[PDB]
Amino acid sequence: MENIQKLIARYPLVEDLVALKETTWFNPGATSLAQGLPYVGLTEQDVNAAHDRLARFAPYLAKAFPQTAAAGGMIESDVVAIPAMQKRLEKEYGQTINGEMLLKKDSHLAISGSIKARGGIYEVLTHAEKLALEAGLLTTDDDYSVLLSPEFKQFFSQYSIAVGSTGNLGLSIGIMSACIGFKVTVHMSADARAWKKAKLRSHGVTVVEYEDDYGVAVEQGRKAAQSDPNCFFIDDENSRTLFLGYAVAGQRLKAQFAQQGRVVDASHPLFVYLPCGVGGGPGGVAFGLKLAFGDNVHCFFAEPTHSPCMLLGVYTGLHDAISVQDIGIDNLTAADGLAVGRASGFVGRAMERLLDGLYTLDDQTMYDMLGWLAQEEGIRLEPSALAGMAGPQRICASVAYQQRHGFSQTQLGNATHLVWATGGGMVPEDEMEQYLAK
């Protein structure tokens, strides 16, 4: 009634969300690592176990994917300085980026060039391990390169994987599963991009299309998998296994910074800008980053103006009890990996205290910056992977965010701004030329 409209008036940013206006929200309740940790429900030991499991699978990956052999079967991406892009952004948008801007190239991760691959590949491998252990065919002391044998491939070919996805997660699962031996079915909305559907279908992956949203595709994926004990559902909304897979990135990045001699501390703060779809990818990475760098890393989520599911969920405190469609937002965006109308739930509650803020940007901003990055640095990405690129200027422009955290412009001169590129390596020439044309 009158109280319901009094309640809504307490959440004025929702008006801007409905109006599709680019905005930024800084979390007034962002906490220390210690204060936020209990809400995650996962520990550093859980992350260490993920690291250990990837090291067990490293001989397998080195043999199966020889491009990783020099790194010993580790799947990791470059981190590069992008100073020409930094200057271009300053020219185009008229806001100084204090400090130094870098790009984390998960767009070019080996085997499958996406942030989602960190989790997808990890989950597939974790699941294969579980099946082999419980069949009494493997122990954690065995050399996991044995799993590449025709015998083990045959064993795994008895099983299937089901997954609801916008595209990239399915691609990474399909690629790893083909090697392991699993059959795959990807459940996806009709809204998903044609080229990602075609790429799965051309590689022996079953695609089930739904005349509904991503959320329905995931739920119908769940139901289909329940019928068959040999079918395993990878749950993009709920999987802690995916989450931990992404979290591996934290210590990897710290090691890279250590190699590059790059300092992160109170006087050299690290800011990280993460594209957000359902929240699993950016949430997991953020968790790993927080464990690695503590209170000196400051994480932000970036969403399309047409799909601000996580910002809406966190800002209202409703999380997954509300969707963007609930308030008239169409969930239609060129950032197809981020076209998720309802936030994870578990990520929202687990990670909100560990996020300094969340912001939105338009498709045109993503397209413009996509072109500029190619022009300035020679790096070609998909639209979703540009969501974090708007971040450094949102932060450097906000005097009041700097007020809240005891920063200044002078202090930010010592800052590192890390834009997390989430996809681009798997994009065909025809599709990339279309993105460059806007």
| Binding interface with Na ion (CB under 5 A) | 303, 307, 309, 338, 340
Q: C-beta of 340: minimal distance to Na ion in Å?
A: 5
Q: Residue 269 or 313: which CB sits closer to Na ion?
A: 313
Helix (H, G, I), strand (E, B), or coil: what is residue 155?
helix
Instruction: Identify the bridge partners of residue 25 per DSSP, sorted by sequence position.
Output: 358
Contact (Cβ atoms closer than 8 angstroms) between residue 22 and residue 36: no
When the beta carbons of 206 and 325 are compared against Na ion, the nearer one is: 325
Adjacency order of strands within the sheet including 183-189: 206-210, 183-189, 160-164, 231-234
Q: What is the rounded CA–CA span in Å between residue 394 and residue 399?
A: 10
> Residue 100 belongs to what H/E stretch?
strand 100-105
Could you give the C-alpha distances from 377 to 98, 159, 184, 201, 421, in angstroms and in order? 19, 43, 37, 33, 13
> Distance between terminal CA atoms of the chain?
45
Dist. CA 185–CA 227, nearest whole Å: 14
Minimum CB distance to Na ion, residue 38 (Å): 26
Neighbours of 260 (CB within 10 A): 12
Output 60 or 367, the one with its CB closest to Na ion.
367
CB-side exposure of 77: number of CA atoms within 13 Å? 29
Q: Which residues pair with 164 in a beta bridge?
A: 187
**Residue number with CB closer to Na ion (175 or 314):** 314
Q: How far is the CB of 111 from Na ion (least distance, A)?
A: 25
Alpha carbon distance 112, 114 (integer Å): 6
Rounded to a whole number of angstroms, the minimum distance from the CB of residue 303 to Na ion is 4
Q: Which residue has the tokens 């949430």?
A: 283
Nearest approach, Cβ of residue 322 and Na ion (Å): 13
Closest CB to Na ion among 250 and 275?
275
Place of tokens 């199966």: 64
Min CB(22)–Na ion separation in Å: 14
Of 344 and 402, CB closest to Na ion: 344
The closest of 215, 338, 340, 350 to 283, measured between CA atoms, is 350
Write b or e for each residue in 67-88: b if 16 or more Cβ atoms lie within 10 A of its Cβ, otherwise e. Answer: ebeeeebbbbbebeebeebbeb
The letter for the amino acid at 155 is F
For residues 21 and 87, which CB has a smaller minimum distance to Na ion in the complex? 21
Tell which residue, 240, 252, 306, 253, has the closest CA to residue 277: 306
- Distance in Å, CB of 406 to Na ion, minimum: 30
- Residue 162 or 278: the one with the smaller Cβ distance to Na ion is 278
Taking the least distance from each CB to Na ion, the nearer of 307 and 422 is: 307
As measured in angstroms, the least distance from the Cβ of 57 to Na ion is 31
CB of residue 373 vs Na ion: minimum separation in angstroms?
Answer: 21
